[PDB]
C-alpha cells in the first residue's frame with residue numbers, strides 16, 4: 001500500500017474567513033497519516049506543546065491534539081504523528097539535545113511519554129538541518145536510540161511500537177553535510193523528502209517551487225534542484241525507495257517581475273505581492289491561485305519541469321494543481337517510490353470554495369488519494 005501522509009499545521013486556524021482551517025475540515029481517507037506541525041522542546045530537552053491551544057484548556061476547548069486525534073473515530077485506518085522541529089524551531093536546540101547519550105535520552109523519553117499521553121502513533125523529527133560531522137553522527141545516534149526506545153516501550157506495554165520518521169532535506173549540499181544515509185535508513189519507518197522550495201522569493205531568480213525535473217530554461221548549476229534528482233539522490237545514497245515519500249506542495253511561490261514583458265522561467269524579480277489569506281510575501285495558497293485564474297491570469301504549462309505557472313500583470317507564480325499532481329502520481333508509481341506526502345492540508349482548496357470548483361473537496365490532495373490510494377474524495 002502507498003503511504004499518503006499529510007501535514008496539519010496548528011496555526012492555520014488563525015487565518016481569516018475561507019482560509020481558516022481546523023481539524024474538522026479533514027475528510028476520511030484523504031490521508032493515511034497526519035503529521036502534526038509542530039511539537040516543541042524546552043531548554044532542558046523535554047518536550048511540550050508549541051501552541052497552548054494544542055492542549056485542552058478554558059479558552060481553546062478540547063485543544064488541537066484531541067481534535068486531530070478524534071479524526072481517527074471516523075477514519076479508522078488513519079495514523080497520526082507529532083512532528084518536532086520545523087523551520088522556526090531552528091538548529092541550536094537540536095544541536096544541544098543531540099549532543100550526548102544523556103541529552104538525547106531526556107528528549108527521547110519525554111517525547112515517547114508525550115505522544116502516548118496525547119494519542120499519537122509516531123514521532124517525526126524535522127531538524128532543519130543537521131550540519132557537520134558532529135551533527136551527522138549525533139543525528140544517526142538520535143534516530144537509532146529513538147527507535148530502540150520505541151521498541152522498548154512497545155515490549156514493556158504490549159502496544160504496537162511508535163513510528164519514527166523525519167522530514168529531510170532535498171538539496172545535495174545539505175544532504176551531504178548532515179545525513180549519513182546508510183546509517184539512518186535502518187531506523188526510519190519512512191522519510192518525508194522535502195522535494196519543494198527549490199526556487200523562491202528569497203532570491204531574484206524566477207523558477208519553480210517543485211519542478212519534477214530540471215529545465216534548460218534555468219541555469220545548469222541548479223540541475224539537481226528538482227523532485228526527481230532529490231529522490232534519486234536519497235535512493236543512491238542508501239535509502240530504499242519504499243521509504244522515500246515524495247513531497248507535494250499545495251502552496252506556490254511567486255515574484256514581482258523586474259520586467260512584466262519578460263515572463264520566461266529564468267527571468268528575474270523580487271517577492272510577489274502578499275496574498276490576502278496567507279499574508280506571507282512570496283507564497284500563496286492553491287485557493288488563492290484559482291481565483292487569480294478566474295480573474296484572468298494566464299496559465300502556462302512547463303513541459304520540461306512538468307508544473308504550471310501563471311502570470312497576472314507583473315506577478316509570476318509557480319504553483320501546483322490537479323494536473324501537476326496527476327503527473328507526479330504517475331511518476332511515484334512508475335519509479336517505485338513509497339508514496340507522497342503533502343505540505344499542507346490547509347493550502348489545498350479544502351472546502352471547495354474556489355469560484356471554479358466542481359465541488360471537489362481537496363482538488364489537489366484528492367489526486368493522491370485516488371491515484372495512490374484508490375480513494376474517491378467526495379464533493380461538498
Ligand SMILES: CCOc1ccc([C@@H]2c3c(-c4ccccc4O)n[nH]c3C(=O)N2Cc2cccnc2)cc1
Nearest residue numbers: 086087088126167194197200202251280283284343
Ligand atoms: C527557504 C525556504 O524556507 C522555508 C520552506 C518551507 C517552510 C515550511 C513552512 C511554512 C510555509 C511553507 C510554505 C508556504 C507558506 C509557509 O508559511 N510555514 N511554516 C513552515 C515550516 O516549518 N516549513 C518547513 C517544513 C517542515 C516540515 C515539512 N516541510 C517543510 C519554511 C521555510
